[PDB]
Design an enzyme around this catalytic site. Structure first.
Site, short mmCIF file in Angstrom:
data_model
loop_
_atom_site.label_atom_id
_atom_site.label_comp_id
_atom_site.label_asym_id
_atom_site.label_seq_id
_atom_site.Cartn_x
_atom_site.Cartn_y
_atom_site.Cartn_z
N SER A 269 -6.38 2.21 3.58
CA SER A 269 -6.02 1.71 2.59
C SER A 269 -6.64 0.64 1.88
CB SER A 269 -5.03 0.86 3.84
OG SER A 269 -3.81 1.77 3.91
N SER B 101 0.89 -1.10 0.37
CA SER B 101 0.52 0.27 0.06
C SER B 101 0.46 1.09 0.18
CB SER B 101 -0.98 0.17 1.40
OG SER B 101 -1.95 -0.95 0.92
N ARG C 68 4.90 -0.60 13.52
CA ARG C 68 5.87 0.05 11.63
C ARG C 68 5.69 1.80 12.52
NH1 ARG C 68 1.06 -1.47 8.26
NH2 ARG C 68 0.36 -1.52 10.28
N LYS D 80 0.26 3.59 -2.85
CA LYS D 80 -0.84 4.36 -3.38
C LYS D 80 0.05 6.16 -3.43
CE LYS D 80 -4.64 1.57 -0.47
NZ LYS D 80 -4.48 0.41 -0.75
C1 LIG Z 1 -4.06 -6.82 0.45
S1 LIG Z 1 -3.16 -6.95 2.53
O1 LIG Z 1 -2.95 -5.92 3.46
O2 LIG Z 1 -2.17 -8.15 2.30
N1 LIG Z 1 -5.08 -7.76 2.60
C2 LIG Z 1 -5.82 -6.49 3.67
C3 LIG Z 1 -4.60 -5.83 5.29
C4 LIG Z 1 -5.25 -7.06 6.07
C5 LIG Z 1 -4.76 -6.22 7.76
C6 LIG Z 1 -4.84 -5.12 7.68
C7 LIG Z 1 -5.10 -4.33 6.66
C8 LIG Z 1 -4.42 -3.15 6.83
C9 LIG Z 1 -6.19 -2.36 6.71
C10 LIG Z 1 -6.02 -0.89 6.72
C11 LIG Z 1 -4.68 -0.31 6.87
C12 LIG Z 1 -4.07 -0.94 7.03
C13 LIG Z 1 -2.46 -0.34 8.02
O3 LIG Z 1 -1.40 -1.26 8.09
O4 LIG Z 1 -2.22 1.22 7.56
C14 LIG Z 1 -3.76 -2.46 6.64
C15 LIG Z 1 -5.28 -4.56 5.06
#
Ligand SMILES: CS(=O)(=O)NCc1cccc(-c2cccc(C(=O)O)c2)c1
Ligand SMILES: [Cl-]
Length: 242
Positions: free
Chosen positions: A95, A47, A227, A50
């Site tokens: 994201s 992400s 992070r 992005k």
């Molecule tokens: C495509 S993937 O990322 O492998 N799976 C989906 C997935 C799984 C667990 C967490 C997120 C997520 C959602 C919003 C925000 C954030 C962030 O780190 O800021 C992370 C997304």
């Protein structure tokens, strides 16, 4: 121009994790990292892509401005905040993958590749599906390459309009108070090993800017909060933030 500070490894080993933090002092044009080899190891951007995706979409007119609404397609996904309408700001904040997949589809393979080369972004390889290559395709970028890209964005030096870059820097806004401003983007790569988390951006001070890029092994989502926590512990240690 670069210096290794292995004392920072304590902030990773503290959490039984492994990773790299890279800092760049813009005024002094000096970089700092805990692991020179991993600073130059290239991973899936996930992400964090992005940022460039937003720039390209804005500069090509796929996204008219930061208020344009991209409506939920009605398909319930496991992340609640994704099951709603979004604009550029909120899509970045949460994201929202499906929103940026639609951007990529409208951008197209040809223009996406052309622009990543103009950006000098990572390995500039979009091999795979145009709407998921940054998650399971061939694109790769290192921590030091993220900072190279971010510095161009900060100075409005990327080969897109100043407007496009200002809007994306607005969308990157993460934290602000009387002491500092942080503009950044998170990332979470899970589809190809090793699973890692990203946090790239910069810290704005009254009279200097500190660019940062970090990644770390992320075997489960439980450690995603590390992070920001590890990064801020380095910043605190270096007296960049209180
Ligand atoms: C495509 S993937 O990322 O492998 N799976 C989906 C997935 C799984 C667990 C967490 C997120 C997520 C959602 C919003 C925000 C954030 C962030 O780190 O800021 C992370 C997304
Ligand atoms: Cl702003």
């Amino acid at each position: 121009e670069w210096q290794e500070n292995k004392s920072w490894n304590a902030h990773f080993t503290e959490h039984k994790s492994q990773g790299v933090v890279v800092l760049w002092n813009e005024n002094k044009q000096q970089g700092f990292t805990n692991n020179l080899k991993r600073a130059n190891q290239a991973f899936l951007p996930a992400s964090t892509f992005k940022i460039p995706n937003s720039l390209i979409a804005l500069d090509l007119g796929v996204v008219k401005d930061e208020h344009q609404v991209f409506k939920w397609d009605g398909q319930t996904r496991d992340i609640a905040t994704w099951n709603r309408d979004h604009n550029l700001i909120t899509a970045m904040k949460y994201s929202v993958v499906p929103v940026y997949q639609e951007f990529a589809r409208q951008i197209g393979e040809a223009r996406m590749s052309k622009m990543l080369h103009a950006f000098d972004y990572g390995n500039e390889d979009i091999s795979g599906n145009v709407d998921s290559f940054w998650l399971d395709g061939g694109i790769r970028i290192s921590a030091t390459e993220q900072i190279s890209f971010l510095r161009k964005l900060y100075h409005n030096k990327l080969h897109v309009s100043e407007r496009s870059q200002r809007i994306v820097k607005q969308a990157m806004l993460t934290e602000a108070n009387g002491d500092y401003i942080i503009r950044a983007k998170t990332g979470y790569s899970t589809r190809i090993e090793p699973k890692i988390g990203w946090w790239v951006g910069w810290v704005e001070l009254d009279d200097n800017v500190w660019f940062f890029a970090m990644n770390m092994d992320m075997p489960t989502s439980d450690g995603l909060g590390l992070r920001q926590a590890i990064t801020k512990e380095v910043l605190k240690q270096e007296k960049i933030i209180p």
